[PDB]
Amino acid sequence: LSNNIEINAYIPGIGHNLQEHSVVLVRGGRVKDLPGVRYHIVRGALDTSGVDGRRQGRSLYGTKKPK
Amino acid sequence: AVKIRLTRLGSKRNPFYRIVVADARSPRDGRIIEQIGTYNPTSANAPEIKVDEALALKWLNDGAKPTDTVHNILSKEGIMKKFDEQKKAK
Amino acid sequence: RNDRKVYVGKVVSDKMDKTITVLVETYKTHKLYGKRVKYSKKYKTHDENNSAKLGDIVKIQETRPLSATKRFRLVEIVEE
Amino acid sequence: ARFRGSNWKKSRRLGISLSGTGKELEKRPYAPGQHGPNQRKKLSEYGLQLREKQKLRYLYGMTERQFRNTFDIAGKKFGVHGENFMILLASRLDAVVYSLGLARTRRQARQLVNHGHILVDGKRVDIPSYSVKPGQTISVREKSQKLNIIVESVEINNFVPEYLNFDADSLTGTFVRLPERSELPAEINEQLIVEYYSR
RNA sequence: AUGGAGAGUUUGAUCCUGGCUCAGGAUGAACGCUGGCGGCGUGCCUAAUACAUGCAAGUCGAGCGAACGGACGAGAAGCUUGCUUCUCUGAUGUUAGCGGCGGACGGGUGAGUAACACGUGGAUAACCUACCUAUAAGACUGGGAUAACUUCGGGAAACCGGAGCUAAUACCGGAUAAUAUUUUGAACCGCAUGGUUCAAAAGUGAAAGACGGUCUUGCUGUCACUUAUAGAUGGAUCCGCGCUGCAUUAGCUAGUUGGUAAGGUAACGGCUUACCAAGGCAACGAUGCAUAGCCGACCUGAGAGGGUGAUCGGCCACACUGGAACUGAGACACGGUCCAGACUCCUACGGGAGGCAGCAGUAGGGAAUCUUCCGCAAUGGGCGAAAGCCUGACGGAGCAACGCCGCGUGAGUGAUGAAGGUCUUCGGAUCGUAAAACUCUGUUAUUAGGGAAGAACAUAUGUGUAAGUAACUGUGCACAUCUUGACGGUACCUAAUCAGAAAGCCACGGCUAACUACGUGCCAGCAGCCGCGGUAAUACGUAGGUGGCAAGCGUUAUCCGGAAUUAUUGGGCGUAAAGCGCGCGUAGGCGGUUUUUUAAGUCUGAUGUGAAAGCCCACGGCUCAACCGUGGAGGGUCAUUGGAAACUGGA
Ligand SMILES: [Mg+2]
Ligand SMILES: [Mg+2]
Ligand SMILES: [Mg+2]
Ligand SMILES: [Mg+2]
Ligand SMILES: [Mg+2]
Ligand SMILES: [Mg+2]
Ligand SMILES: [Mg+2]
Ligand SMILES: [Mg+2]
Ligand SMILES: [Mg+2]
Ligand SMILES: [Mg+2]
DSSP states (O other), X not given: OTTSOOXXXXXXXXXXXXXXXXXXXXXXXXXXXXXXXXXXXXXTSTTOOOOTTOOSSGGGGTOOOOO | OEEEEEEEEEETXXXXXXXXXXXXXXXXXXXXXXXXXXXXXXXXXXXXXXXXXXXXXXXXXXXXXXXXXXXXXXXXXXXXXXHHHHHHHX | OOOOOEEEEEEEEOXXXXXXXXXXXXXXXXXXXXXXXXXXXXXXXXXXXXXXXXXOEEEEEEOSOOSSSOOEEEEEEXXX | OOSOSOHHHHHHHHTSOSSSSOHHHHHOOSOOSTTSTTOOOOOOHHHHHHXXXXXXXXXXXXXXHHHHHHHXXXXXXXXXXXXXXXXXXXXXXXXXXXXXXXXXXXXXXXXHHHHTOEEXXXXXXXXXXXXXXTTEEEEEOGXXXXXXXXXXXXXXXXXXXXXXXXXXXXXXXXXXXXXXXXXXXXXXXXXXXXXXXXX
């Protein structure tokens, strides 16, 4: 993180375009299954791309309105 | 210099002034010595005015000097004439 | 005209020259539990003639600063 | 109005004629949607309180924020909270115009007041949220004194409550006094809404 | 009386205990999707990080000399009487400079500060105060300089020197004046120290002129000047009480605590020094460490409480870092000075310069916070006699759904249940009066016209009246008139045209309102908790429908609530977490019955104060509302004072 703390962040949605050195936005909220994963990566912010093919609850996955 | 002046209240494009005795160095809308009245120049197409004559005369005798608008307001209320008459006939 | 605060208290030390320390006792109430609890405050007062002695109940009155920490003057010895 | 939706579907959902005619419930008195027919589930207590609140809110054609604010201000009045809330909802210019009968529908009266065909004490009022008070008069704009809709609604002689005194010749109504619970619709249990806003 | 809801989850099942979690409210928010408008607010919380550039403090010619400038209007005719020089007059004006006042306000910031910093209540017989107001008395008589300017010399610049000359409301001597200082006497009074008044004397310094009127240089108006005493304002000091975490911080203090003398200060004082003494603080938490600007208030809660200290007001502190003083009524001074330090810049390399936590803006940091805008028209401030100048205070506009409030995205009729989507038991059901179509409206929007208030004034011009005058001009007051708008041709109003440009977000297993079909098949994926998904998934993704909201809806972060889960209100310790292994005993806490007395607690009345804004109640004004305004009510463990004696405390 920008404060030099290293964390594990879950990537929500189906399919992602993230690799090493990608710049991502991280919010709170742990994944109960994953022990040491205590944060989430916001979709549709900075490098992270929106979920492709998502149509319901798009704002939660950073997908634009298809129209 | 003690002075009698208008401190602004109300809202944007809707001023409403309180008439206050305050030190000249104090901020406008800030510390005051004592309020004596109110002055609304946007009421019923005629400036509404309220003043306490006793306090106005006390401060005029003490040495507080009004501003232009406060002097006009006190003249309209007749306080200036009474102060002048008392000073002349003291 | 305007008077100055006067307190009554016991003398708890007089080793200083012309100075006696007076312990005024009060009872502040606990702000949450409301119980009465003792509160002592020591006052440094001027004793010009060293009349007051360790133990006697004396009376003090507030004055202008007289020393680094003396703000009171002995008025009378209520008891002894 | 602000909610531009199927008032028939809303009436069917809430089991009440928002228009007051009953046409919506005449044929299909059950809820809309794929599961409308053969619907037999039982509402919980929260569901019942919510349904009562929604009945009143959609009856008066208001949004949730304004409805809640009106309920809050009514709570500050002296008396029974629910009755005060109901009379305050009745006092709205939309409700007053609709009761006077210058329109055949509450939404139509809302559009009239919004477009400014109404005057209160002889002055224009564009805001349907306006809260009328006893002793005031509601008139109609001269440029719109001969509107087909308004004249037809006036011709249809509807009942005028006691708290309103109307004269159709001048198209002039008067808000005489505050309404009463009996005058206000009895299909609403205001205690349920009070409890809903309690939790 | 205005006020208080619970639910899921430990088991095969149960009751209890117990934590975890959820439903509410809030925000200077950020992010994701989406996004029409108006009104009122709010908008660098991070780096007290560094800052390009512009602007944020000047004004006074009615204090002063000088310079520039040149009307009105002189002289010769160049025979051009329309153009001309110097031998003039030279007015309306402008300025670099001396001098006065203002640069100590206004604006920014919260680093430091755990402290009489702040809040509340008091005290100063220990204090200071320019400008302002009132009263009284004065403003007399002389003098020496210097800036500017001219000249010579040295500089890239910053700018420097030497010589010569000249002003003042600049500076200085003397004269008279004191409630100020010394001494003596007297009168009265108080909270130790002391305070007020009177009478004698001795020492003793103040000042200024400018612009006008009458003109008799005599009188005199306004402003300005000096001394004294009061008022007002502002500031200073002291004190009770309140105001934070840690003992895995227990000792701290040597000018330290007191006295004497002196010095010093507006002022008292170890404030400082010399001497004498050994005192002072601390388990009622000293010292140390950590963190922090404090408050009015703000959020939440039924309350008690808990959390916070943005915007606005008060108080404090700071101005690259540290120290110091100068000038001044006032500073140890944000856009002053000196010194030291870090950092940065310019240079002709000789040497010079700077401090945005002012308004914009740049770079950087950050999840994140705006225009290098307009005007002094309003209010306020500085200077000026005034017009007026200055004013990034302020008043406005610009941007941002950041918040709150208001209005839209249409309304009536409309079964003939149209097409089409989804489901189906293949009959139908549903989207659905929804749609289509007819009728209506123009809030909004486009076009074209009209168009506020906010503006009071000041000044100037006319009169009237009042103190003074010997009388005017003037001065105070009163009534009239010309003129003054950045916003802005904006708000608002009118007329015409069109439903036409203006709906999205989340959710639908229980909590919790809302269910079905396909795809998938412990995978992909969901998830706040319990959990869901391995072919019949209302829990994953899509679709139809439905629910909640709606120009917003969700997510994340943080605070209060629910949590009686630190329990004063309002919990416990046999077996759930919890009685020290047990004595002896210090401080503290608590304490048997009666009588008298005190009034510290306790109870009751009066007075002052608890700013304003805010919350609550009422009323009034914006078309409504938010918002704005005005009254009321509230808020102290507050203080002074008078009363009662049952209980606790004292005798
Ligand atoms: Mg700090
Ligand atoms: Mg509670
Ligand atoms: Mg300065
Ligand atoms: Mg600066
Ligand atoms: Mg700045
Ligand atoms: Mg960045
Ligand atoms: Mg609690
Ligand atoms: Mg046990
Ligand atoms: Mg035992
Ligand atoms: Mg108040």
